[PDB]
Design a binder for this molecule. Structure first.
Ligand SMILES: C[C@H]1CCCCN1C(=O)N1CCOCC1
Ligand SMILES: *[C@@H]1O[C@H](CO)[C@@H](O)[C@H](O)[C@H]1NC(C)=O
Length: 340
């Protein structure tokens, strides 16, 4: 069980002005810290956000959050469930800003909602330093789906924050799960993100912003465009046939659709060729790192917990302990270890 703490700075808020927060389970024998960003789509205008407030309110408000949460997958403290980091300090940061973790806008007489995702991450880090994060040797910022994209948008800002506060010894790293999308043509999207960025006052990493320039910041939401600009080490986990990617592509089998699906897997593989820490199985699925059975899937005979352990060793190629693992077979579930 991870225990809830509402932010002491009550001006850093969820969408409806209630305080944001985090769930924590400390491990005082460990100098490793895992901060996980929840996912859950987003909203991009007044009418769409009002609908989300009616039926997805826990993603917009802390008023109904429970006092505890069970850690699962990479957040589990049991070695059998989490071979990688079972002894780490565990943090789950609820997603209550509806802005893919990019926003920096308060509620006001001109704004019905607050979009503060980027500031929530910064404030959680600041308040954790008093609870033991000051002694860390590794801070791993992880996340799934919208939270995976949030890792790519925020990992370098956390590194800069800790350096400027005077903690140069904490190594900041990222783990992005199911947050690596393609801006491809549909079988039968980017405009919603463009409108969202303006609605949220959304912010993107500085080097990527300088490349694409004013009005084109939406480009930095796409992994293959923002990843080369990042300085912190980032491990990318991405199913080749991700269900959210197919949903946005309007895919729900004849020759035209067969070619479309094969092309999607080929393009995704291409974008990961120069990503040296990555795990990309040929499966139709969505998210992995906080699922209890995340230990089951393998690429070339290597599980995800093993690949992550090999990554840790590389940050001290390694015989028998690979870090770049991308399937080459071209159809969903051509890998026999895919979830069923
Ligand atoms: C999965 C969601 C939430 C997080 C960012 C990526 N997401 C999108 O819905 N997108 C991205 C751009 O292309 C299609 C629209
Ligand atoms: C609380 O957060 C807001 C927004 O980041 C910031 O302007 C303010 O300085 C913070 N308060 C304190 C005491 O740090």
């Amino acid at each position: 069980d991870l225990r809830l703490h509402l932010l002491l700075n009550t001006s850093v808020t969820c969408n409806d002005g209630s305080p944001a927060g985090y769930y924590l389970k400390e491990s005082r024998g460990s100098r490793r810290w895992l901060l996980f960003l929840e996912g859950g789509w987003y909203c991009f205008n007044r009418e769409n956000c009002d609908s989300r407030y009616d039926t997805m309110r826990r993603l917009m408000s802390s008023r109904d959050w429970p006092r505890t949460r069970t850690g699962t997958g990479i957040l589990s403290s049991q070695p059998e469930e989490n071979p990688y980091w079972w002894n780490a300090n565990m943090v789950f940061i609820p997603y209550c800003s509806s802005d893919v973790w990019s926003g920096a806008s308060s509620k006001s007489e001109k704004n019905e909602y607050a979009f503060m995702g980027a500031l929530i991450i910064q404030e959680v880090v600041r308040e954790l330093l008093g609870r033991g994060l000051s002694g860390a040797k590794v801070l791993l910022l992880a996340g799934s789906s919208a939270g995976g994209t949030g890792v790519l948008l925020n990992v370098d800002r956390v590194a800069e924050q800790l350096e400027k506060l005077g903690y140069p010894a904490i190594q900041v790293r990222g783990l992005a799960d199911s947050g690596w999308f393609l801006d491809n043509k549909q079988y039968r999207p980017t405009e919603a993100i463009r409108r969202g960025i303006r609605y949220w006052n959304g912010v993107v990493p500085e080097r990527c912003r300088r490349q694409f320039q004013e009005g084109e910041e939406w480009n930095c939401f796409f992994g293959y465009k923002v990843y080369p600009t990042l300085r912190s080490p980032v491990f990318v986990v991405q199913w080749l046939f991700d269900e959210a990617q197919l949903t946005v592509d309007n895919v729900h089998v004849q020759e035209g659709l067969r070619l479309y699906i094969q092309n999607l897997g080929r393009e995704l593989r291409h974008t990961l060729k120069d990503v040296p820490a990555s795990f990309a199985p040929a499966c139709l699925s969505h998210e992995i790192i906080i699922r209890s059975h995340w230990t089951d899937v393998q690429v070339k005979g290597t599980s995800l917990p093993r690949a992550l352990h090999c990554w840790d060793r590389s940050l001290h190629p390694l015989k028998g302990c690979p870090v770049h693992l991308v399937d080459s077979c071209p159809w969903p579930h051509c890998n026999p270890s895919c979830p069923t």
